Design a protein around this nucleic acid. Structure first.
Ligand code: MVM
Ligand code: MG
Ligand code: MG
Ligand code: MG
Ligand code: MG
Ligand code: MG
Ligand code: MG
Ligand code: MG
Ligand code: MG
Ligand code: MG
Ligand code: MG
Ligand code: MG
Ligand code: MG
Ligand code: MG
Ligand code: MG
Ligand code: MG
Ligand code: MG
Ligand code: MG
Ligand code: MG
Ligand code: MG
Ligand code: MG
Ligand code: MG
Ligand code: MG
Ligand code: MG
Ligand code: MG
Ligand code: MG
Ligand code: MG
Ligand code: MG
Ligand code: MG
Ligand code: MG
Ligand code: MG
Ligand code: MG
Ligand code: MG
Lengths: 153, 25, 63, 396
RNA sequence: GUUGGAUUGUUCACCCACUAAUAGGGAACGUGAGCUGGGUUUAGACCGUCGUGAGACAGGUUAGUUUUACCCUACUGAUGA
RNA sequence: CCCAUAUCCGCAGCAGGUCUCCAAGGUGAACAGCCUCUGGCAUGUUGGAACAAUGUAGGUAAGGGAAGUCGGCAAGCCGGA
RNA sequence: GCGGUGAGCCUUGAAGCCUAGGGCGCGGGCCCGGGUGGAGCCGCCGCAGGUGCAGAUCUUGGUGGUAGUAGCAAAUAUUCAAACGAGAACUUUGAAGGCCGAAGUGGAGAAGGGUUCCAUGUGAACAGCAGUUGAACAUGGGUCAGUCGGUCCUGAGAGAUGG
RNA sequence: GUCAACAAGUACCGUAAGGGAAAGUUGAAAAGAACUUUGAAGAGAGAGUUCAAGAGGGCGUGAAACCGUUAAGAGGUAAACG
């Protein structure tokens, strides 16, 4: 459509979006920071080990109250988690982007995740019931996601 | 969400009442 | 698929509770296309739906 | 305003911080003062806590209530296999302390000591000290070694040998040995250096360090208790039964001013697994290991000249959570820090022992060997069988 | 280092007993998101005195809801840089 | 058709509130408490892994036996016949 | 905003908005370049005001930090296999293990609700995890009386007419 | 500006008397995206319409607070400022 960071040559690259995905924003953001720059095969293998809890996701900015993991010293950091829903929606989008590379004739064994970002999407509203007859918001924080897979070897 | 004016009035009374019981002049 | 209707009708045509209705687990889709009470009675005569007996509460020790 | 009733302060500020120990072996922080008029001798040794039993002996305290009577003392068995000396390190006196000058290792370091240098023995290629050992069989590297001894002879004031235990004589899961620097007192530096070169690659038994009935210091890491609140960690008074939001607490943690919590107030946190050095533990027996002598092994290292039974120091069923002690052991009076299987550092004392209790010649009379895995009744196996009689499961 | 007690809400006081000694104070009359709520202590009630009265009493008596930390710091531990 | 730990009122699938009919076997004085049969349900708006502090609810405790506290508060003792 | 005036400006790009671009003014502010935009706008001379905002526990709307934190702990309890399905801790069927224990967590009503009843279908929202499930959403269907009630009667009481 | 430019005395609230909102704009024209492809779908990638989708069915313009990303610079006396 209209992305941030159009690729350096729009012939050796493909792309995919996803809008109003109901993941958390903060958990999807730290997952995408892990995936940025990885080769496409390494990223898929990594993102399925988050769902099996063999390799963690280092939470760096959004980390208040996040516990400390033994797998996180691999990333040079202390605290980490294993976001399952954030990893699964980043596998649907990545499989989508891989098939966008086969529609336009690229070798998908050389793709590298160049650009990735998540944005905050419009919030969804529910309600919660509190002590002395009060209603509070119980909002949700969905996300937009976009990525560019430029191939290089 | 709807905010009820009365819930505040009731709470205020409790706070005022609590101050009187807890405070000796 | 889901046999919630069939369990209810098989207790009504048979006058037990739902805890005494045995649906055959192996014949689980011949029961599933039985949406009426004539078709439930036919499966009872066939033997796919049996009523279970009561569990024993003997009075032997208090006798 | 003042406290109306004064009470002594809970806990000691001289053991702060109450953190987990950064080490696990137990560090000598102060060896005995070296005077060269003495002979040349080692100052420390490294044994493992096996378990406790109790003894009977007759007391010679002239003028006491227990004089010429039988008391029961609680002892601690520390199992001490011979340490293997594999290195020498020399220190020089500096205006900033005592830096290490030069380190020389032996030619053949065993795999249980080479296992110490790795975090994962199973994935390594076992390459430690392999380019180093070739200069003991060289000429251009050989001449480097005696220049590194003679410079260490003419500069160093402190010599320390690098020794290790041998874990394959122990019943434990661990195979990785424990290294230690044990310093050498007595004699001149040249005199204590060529002593240590003779000892290099060889074994040092524990009775060549410690004697019968001398008082030694025991260094180690205490038994870890985890995260404990202030009633267990600092032994504060519990608050009464009718306290809202809990009672196992310290009620006031400071006044208004200074507007800060001081370091002296009891707080919750880690209890146990602290490094501690306790002194004046008297040796009661240096026990001999199981040796195979005339084809069958002599196993009577808990016998006395009053008991004459053919029993080992092992209770029936073995030491609980430890195993059995087939090696040389030390019998200390009282309790020592750490769990069972804890490595204890035991060094000679820093003081001059002049008290009458410190110079008491002891003479053991009975060593208990009842099973510690319950209320044991029988000192040996041959006693229990001779009392109980033939059971059902024997006569099959 | 300077305690255990009887009476009292007590601070104080006084007494019993022990002890080497049973010194004096401070810290928002240290310390209530530490407690307790005994003294004071709103609304109930009784007595005395006062007031024509409603009521009052720096007089006695009895009953009377004690809220929140998940933030920053300090502190205690724990990774880490 | 619901008639209520989800169809009603309480801002809600809210431990509150809201009038009745029928009523098995054992124990026992008993429509008491406990266990079961008919009938009903899936633990009350989430699971998993651990077994630290502090809690909340429940227990036990040598030797003393109210010395605790404003106060025997709380618990314990007592118990049927 | 109005009366006048600039043979004013403008789809060959007005307003508005943005700007590490150029400058001017002591300042209020203004002019120009560039980008975006897509139809109107401005200068002088007078005229007229609902005429300039950081504050008011200001009003309305939006949004943060807190924070992926508090939390999702009242009433003992689940487990194995299969089926359907893209997908099963939660659906259904079976098997076990249990609880309500007849003053029931059972079976029917009165008030009150108003279609929630019952089928089939969906799988977005909602059911504070999840759902192949639902009291949700869609599409259809369903309440039959001389004897069961209302209806009739009077009760406490309410209430016209004559006055 | 009337509370109401719109399915407004409407939805909703209260036993009742009464109280009482929010909400305008695709484009000239629906030409409202055929078809292919990944996915269970939502959603994407191409392709196409149009002067324009940087106009894609709460769609003119699209500010700030706030957020993501890239780029550059820096970082132990909280930032900020003369
Ligand atoms: O629940 C409360 C309660 C406690 C505090 C607040 N407060 N206080 N300050 C406040 C400021 C803002 C909001 N709420 C506030 C409100 C209520 N109780 C209560 N406690 C003490 C006095 C009065 C009451 Cl009513 C009940 C009484 C019944 C037994 N359980 C406790
Ligand atoms: Mg926490
Ligand atoms: Mg004093
Ligand atoms: Mg309390
Ligand atoms: Mg034992
Ligand atoms: Mg305070
Ligand atoms: Mg308080
Ligand atoms: Mg009182
Ligand atoms: Mg009063
Ligand atoms: Mg009188
Ligand atoms: Mg009078
Ligand atoms: Mg419920
Ligand atoms: Mg439970
Ligand atoms: Mg459950
Ligand atoms: Mg006791
Ligand atoms: Mg007393
Ligand atoms: Mg007292
Ligand atoms: Mg009581
Ligand atoms: Mg005007
Ligand atoms: Mg303003
Ligand atoms: Mg949490
Ligand atoms: Mg029960
Ligand atoms: Mg029913
Ligand atoms: Mg019922
Ligand atoms: Mg949900
Ligand atoms: Mg239904
Ligand atoms: Mg345009
Ligand atoms: Mg446009
Ligand atoms: Mg327009
Ligand atoms: Mg608009
Ligand atoms: Mg227009
Ligand atoms: Mg727009
Ligand atoms: Mg940078």
């Amino acid at each position: 459509v209209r992305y941030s960071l159009d690729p350096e040559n729009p012939t050796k690259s493909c792309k995919s979006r996803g809008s109003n995905l109901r993941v958390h924003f903060k958990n999807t953001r730290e997952t995408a920071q892990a995936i940025k720059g990885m080769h496409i095969r390494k990223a898929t293998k990594y993102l399925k080990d988050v769902t099996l809890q063999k390799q963690c996701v280092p939470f760096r900015r959004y980390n208040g109250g996040v516990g400390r993991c033994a797998q996180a010293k691999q990333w040079g950091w202390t605290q980490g988690r294993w976001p399952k829903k954030s990893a699964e929606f980043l596998l649907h989008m990545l499989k989508n982007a891989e098939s966008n590379a086969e529609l336009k004739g690229l070798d998908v064994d050389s793709l590298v995740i160049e650009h990735i970002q998540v944005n905050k999407a419009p919030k969804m509203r529910r309600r919660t019931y509190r002590a002395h007859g009060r209603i509070n918001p119980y909002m949700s924080s969905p996300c937009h996601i976009e990525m560019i897979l430029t191939e290089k070897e | 969400g709807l905010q009820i004016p009365a819930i505040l009035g009731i709470l205020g009374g409790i706070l005022a009442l609590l101050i009187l019981i807890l405070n000796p002049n | 698929s889901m046999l919630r209707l069939q369990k209810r009708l098989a207790s009504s045509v048979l006058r037990c509770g739902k805890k005494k209705v045995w649906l055959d687990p192996n014949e689980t889709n011949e029961i599933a296309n039985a949406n009426s009470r004539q078709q439930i009675r036919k499966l009872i005569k066939d033997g796919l739906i049996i009523r279970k007996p009561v569990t024993v509460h003997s009075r032997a020790r208090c006798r | 305003s003042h406290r109306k009733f004064s009470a002594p302060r809970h806990g000691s500020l001289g053991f702060l911080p109450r953190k987990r120990s950064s080490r696990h072996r137990g560090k000598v922080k102060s060896f005995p003062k070296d005077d060269p008029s003495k002979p040349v001798h080692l100052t420390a040794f490294l044994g493992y806590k096996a378990g406790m039993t109790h003894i009977v002996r007759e007391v010679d305290r002239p003028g006491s209530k227990v004089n010429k009577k039988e008391v029961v003392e609680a002892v601690t068995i520390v199992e001490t296999p011979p340490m293997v000396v594999v290195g020498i390190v020399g220190y020089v006196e500096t205006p900033r302390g005592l830096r290490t000058f030069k380190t020389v290792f032996a030619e053949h370091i065993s795999d249980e000591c080479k296992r110490r240098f790795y975090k994962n023995w199973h994935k390594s290629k076992k390459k430690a000290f392999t380019k180093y050992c070739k200069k003991w069989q060289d000429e251009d590297g050989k001449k480097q070694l005696e220049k590194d001894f003679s410079s260490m002879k003419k500069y160093c004031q402190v010599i320390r040998v690098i020794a290790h235990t041998q874990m394959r004589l122990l019943p434990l899961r661990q195979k990785k040995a424990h290294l230690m620097e044990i310093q050498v007192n007595g004699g001149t530096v040249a005199e204590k250096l060529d002593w240590a070169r003779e000892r290099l690659e060889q074994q040092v038994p524990v009775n060549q360090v410690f004697g019968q009935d001398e008082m030694i210091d025991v260094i180690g890491v205490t038994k870890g208790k985890g995260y404990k609140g202030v009633t267990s960690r600092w032994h504060t008074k519990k608050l009464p039964r009718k306290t809202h939001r809990g009672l196992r607490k310290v009620a006031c943690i400071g006044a208004w001013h200074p507007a800060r919590v001081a370091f002296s107030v009891a707080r919750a946190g880690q209890k146990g697994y602290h490094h501690r050095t306790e002194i004046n533990k008297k040796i009661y027996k240096i026990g001999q290991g199981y040796l195979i002598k005339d084809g069958k092994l002599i196993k009577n290292n808990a016998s006395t000249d009053y008991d004459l039974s053919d029993k080992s120091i092992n209770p029936l069923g073995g030491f609980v959570h430890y195993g059995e002690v087939t090696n040389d052991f030390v019998m200390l009076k009282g309790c020592v820090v750490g769990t069972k299987k804890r490595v204890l550092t035991l060094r000679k004392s820093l003081l001059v022992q002049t008290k009458r209790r410190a110079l008491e010649k002891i003479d053991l009379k009975f060593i208990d060997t009842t099973s510690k895995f319950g209320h044991g009744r029988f000192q040996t196996m041959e006693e229990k069988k001779a009392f109980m009689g033939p059971l059902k499961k024997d006569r099959i």
